[PDB]
Amino acid sequence: ESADLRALAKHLYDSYIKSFPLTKAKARAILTGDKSPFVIYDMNSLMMGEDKIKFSKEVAIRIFQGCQFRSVEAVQEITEYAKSIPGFVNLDLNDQVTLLKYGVHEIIYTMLASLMNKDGVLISEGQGFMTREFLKSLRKPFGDFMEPKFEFAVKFNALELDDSDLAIFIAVIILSGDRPGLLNVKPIEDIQDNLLQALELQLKLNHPESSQLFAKLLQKMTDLRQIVTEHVQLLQVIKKTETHPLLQEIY
Amino acid sequence: QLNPESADLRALAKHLYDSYIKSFPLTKAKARAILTGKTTDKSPFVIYDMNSLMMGEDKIQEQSKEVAIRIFQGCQFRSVEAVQEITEYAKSIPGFVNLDLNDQVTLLKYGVHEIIYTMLASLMNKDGVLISEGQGFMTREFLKSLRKPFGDFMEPKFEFAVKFNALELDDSDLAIFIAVIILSGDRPGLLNVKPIEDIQDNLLQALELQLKLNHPESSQLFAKLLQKMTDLRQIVTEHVQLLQVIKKTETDMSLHPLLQEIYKDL
């Protein structure tokens, strides 16, 4: 038993590395110490960032839209990772679609915590770092955008999880048999149970000193959903401003 | 091999179950007994409509107004007593009274409703809910048909209850779970979070051990229980966002102050 669990864990860790360009081991190195990224902290710090950073309206509207693009991009990565989760591509296609539809938002904020610290967040592959203070200073309602997520990251990162821990954790979120619309819950839940097992063992072997880390992590799914519904409400409010057709479509 | 560490956990579990029974009149076992027929002397008077409601009053505000509202006032008062019960239970939690007093308040302020709906599930089944200490049973349809802004206060509850009840938790599981809920460090305002987490940690140790010993054949029941914690939060939020409406549609309807303080700033 412990066998198959280790296997499943290494499997997910590796798939996680293949599907996600910027791991947490890297985001953390960057945030601390080596090719220092371009700190964006000022309006004029931003303009210089537009050029020094690379592979319409005001400015706050351009940053939020910038997050949109990254989101859609990330969604594909998450989708490719998901297919790696043993048993996933065997489920009914409608359910795979459903699980992804309701699971990506929770996964984006989970991984976003990987690129955040109490003072800011890494943007564009980690080339930059827009400070928390600056983001907060964006004219309403855009200065309530990242503040909530920052409070989440502080708490989530306090668990000190690593890529091998998150790899499994992300899978659990995807295999959530509670998504509205599912046609066949049995298989999904069965997989989640098995994933919950792998994550439990992964935590007691990796963080033997962390008492009940497993329990504290599960408790965070609450925070995630708070974040997600709150973010969805922001989108409603916003959906009232400067009102390409193909772009709006892509989102 | 019973270990001395797991010996304390077991002890912690017996302790909490005891205060749970001592603090709450209507346990799940009794509620269960009443609902499933281990009755002849325990059967409730069922309310599934207006005349039935009229007739139920006898054995089961300070005057009268409207149904939907008389029922609402009903629940309001009932929860004032539950808060009192939970507060009584809280104090029994090893370490809860030692905490800062401000945090004591914080914990209860947010914890009271997650626990009420957790326990309210014990008195429900897909078809309705027990009331008046179990002497009565109000059907899901009667409630869901109440006047516009009210015929929607309960539906989400049943929704969660049939799902939650599916885990098949019994009173000795719930006492520990309820303690976990109260001792949650991630509550707004908490001055001292560390002490609150060392306690909750222990409780979770108790619960994980309790569930494995009590439901050996139920795979990952622990984790499945914890996930439910998010359903409660939404139940609460969804709820709060319903009082506000009552607070606008029904201006002549008062609210017990206590409840007005718990809901305040949430």
Numbering used by the authors:
A (entry chain B): 207 to 239, 243 to 264, 274 to 461, 466 to 473
B (entry chain A): 203 to 262, 271 to 476
Task: Show sentences the authors wrote.
Peroxisome proliferator-activated receptors (PPARs) belong to the nuclear hormone receptor family, which is defined as transcriptional factors that are activated by the binding of ligands to their ligand-binding domains (LBDs). The members of one subgroup, the peroxisome proliferator-activated receptors (PPARα, PPARγ and PPARβ/δ), are the key transcriptional regulators in fatty-acid and glucose metabolism. All of the PPAR LBDs fold into a three-layered sandwich comprising mainly α-helices, as also observed in the nuclear receptor LBDs.
The PPARα and PPARγ LBDs were complexed with the same pan agonist, TIPP-703, which activates all three PPARs and their crystal structures were determined. TIPP-703 (pan agonist), (S)-2-{3-[(4-adamantan-1-ylbenzoylamino)methyl]-4-propoxybenzyl}butyric acid, has a prominent adamantyl group at the para position of the tail benzene ring and a propoxy group on the central benzene ring. Even in the best structures determined at 2.4 Å resolution, the propoxy group located at the centre of TIPP-703 in the PPARγ LBD complex was disordered. On the other hand, the two protomers in the asymmetric unit of the PPARγ LBD–TIPP-703 complex exhibited slightly different conformations at the C-terminus, leading to the loss of several protein–ligand contacts. In contrast, in the PPARγ LBD complex the same group mainly interacts with Arg280 and Ile281 on the H3 helix.
